[PDB]
């Protein structure tokens, strides 16, 4: 212990850390799925594949 | 247009010129502001009654409602200014400059 008073950010807010990581992962997987669906729909509509 | 609309528009213009030309009191300016909405009410109801726009007859009432909302706002600001300075003179509202 160094600080006379406990710092507000003494230990990581694990709830916030988990929410942040989960939100990032969810957004990334959603973006990947959305891109795949967009490519498939574009190819189907243009009659390419 | 008949002369009646001319008279109502002239009255509105007179009330508008009254508001833009302060003399000493803020209360007189508020009275001029209330007269403008009276002229607007009269003009709108004259127009609506003449063309038999039946559903528009509720418009002048909403006009009156927001008229007196503005009058309430002005009276509140006037009492705060009077509490601060002792009089409702517009000359005392000079702390802020352009």
């Amino acid at each position: 212990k160094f600080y006379i008073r406990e710092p507000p950010h003494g230990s990581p807010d694990w709830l916030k850390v988990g929410l942040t990581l989960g939100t990032s992962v969810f957004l990334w997987i959603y973006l990947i799925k959305q891109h795949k669906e967009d490519v498939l729909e574009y190819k189907r509509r243009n009659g390419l594949e | 247009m008949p002369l009646v609309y001319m008279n109502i528009i002239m009255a509105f213009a007179i009330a508008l010129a009254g508001l833009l030309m302060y003399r000493s009191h803020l209360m007189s300016s508020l009275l001029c502001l209330e007269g403008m909405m009276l002229s607007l009410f009269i003009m709108s109801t004259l127009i609506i009654l003449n063309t038999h726009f039946t559903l528009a007859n509720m418009m002048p009432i909403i006009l009156l409602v927001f008229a007196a909302c503005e009058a309430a706002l002005g009276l509140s600001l006037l009492v705060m200014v009077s509490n601060t300075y002792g009089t409702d003179y517009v000359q005392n509202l000079n702390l802020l400059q352009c």
Binding site: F2, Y3, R5, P7, H9, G10, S11 | -
Partner: protein, 321 residues
């Protein structure tokens, strides 16, 4: 919630509900080298209140980082011993010390109010910002400071102390000047032994003629001599049997208490007007000296980053914090 603010207020945390009617602010005052410190200790321990020793230099050091004080060059840039030795210095040390002490007293008062409002426990300060001006008048009437210094002090005191609730109880310990000098000689500290008699008389005149008449109108004022101050039991009994309803504390509500607690929990807004661009030669510091001292302060061990993010003092999980 999890931190006081508008969300906590709309949730329903109310200062009046928190208080227990025994939450009082008591400030002990007296001339130099009196028994006010021991009397404050006794009152705080008997009433169960939290004691706040007189805020000298390095109080801000004690309340931040580690409790250990910092170098004088980095905390205050002023010396009480040097003030005693050469009161009429040519580097403005007297008024630098006075302004720094006023800022420290303001910070301590904010801390005391924050503790009282967040806990409901009363506080006993060994001096307040409402008694600090007596030393300014003593300095001015002895020629130690200038009229410009007095005016700057008055401006800062106005715009800062106008926003805080006055103490509930003001306990003044009246000790005659010759007794003050005798006690100073007995203590044996050379620096305060250099104190002249005219300086001590000016503080007493300021207390008697300005501070006590000014605080008598607000709330209760109790005055004791040396003998009466020695018996703290009667003082605590007198405090416990005070009837008063003419203070601003009864007039306070939950909204005003919320505003006050928001003000006092933010220490930078407390000190906001202590650094106003009034360029007195006493307090103004040049660009180069300011840059050098600020670089040194950042080079201090636990001062480069925020408290939770200093790796050299043993803070882990920084990458996830």
């Amino acid at each position: 919630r999890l931190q006081y603010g508008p969300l906590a207020f709309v949730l329903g945390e109310r200062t009046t509900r928190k208080l227990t009617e025994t939450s009082k602010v008591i400030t002990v005052d007296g001339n130099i080298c009196s028994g006010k410190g021991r009397l404050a200790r006794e009152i705080a321990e008997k009433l169960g209140l939290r004691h706040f020793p007189e805020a000298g230099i390095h109080y801000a050091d004690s309340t931040t980082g580690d409790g250990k004080p910092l170098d004088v060059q980095l905390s205050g840039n002023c010396s009480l011993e040097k003030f005693y030795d050469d009161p009429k210095s040519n580097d403005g040390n007297s008024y630098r010390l006075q302004s720094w002490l006023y800022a420290s007293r303001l910070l301590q008062y904010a801390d005391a109010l924050e503790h009282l409002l967040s806990t409901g426990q009363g506080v006993v300060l060994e001096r307040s910002i409402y008694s600090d001006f007596v030393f300014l008048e003593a300095m001015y009437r002895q020629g130690f400071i200038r009229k410009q210094c007095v005016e700057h002090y008055n401006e800062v005191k106005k715009v800062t102390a106008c926003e805080y609730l006055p103490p509930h109880v003001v306990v003044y310990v009246d000790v005659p000047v010759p007794e003050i000098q005798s006690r100073i000689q007995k203590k044996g500290n050379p620096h305060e032994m250099k104190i002249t008699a005219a300086y001590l008389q000016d503080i007493e005149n300021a207390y008697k003629k300005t501070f006590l008449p000014e605080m008598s109108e607000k709330c209760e004022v109790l005055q004791y001599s040396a003998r009466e101050a020695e018996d703290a039991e009667k003082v605590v009994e007198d405090i416990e049997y005070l009837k008063c309803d003419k203070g601003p504390w009864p007039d306070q509500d939950d909204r005003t208490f919320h505003r006050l607690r928001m003000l006092v929990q933010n220490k930078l807004e407390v000190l906001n007007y202590t650094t106003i661009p009034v360029y007195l030669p006493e307090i103004t510091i040049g660009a180069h000296q300011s840059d050098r001292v600020f670089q040194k302060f950042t080079e201090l061990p636990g001062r480069k980053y925020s408290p939770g993010y200093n790796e050299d003092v043993g803070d882990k999980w920084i990458w996830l914090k």
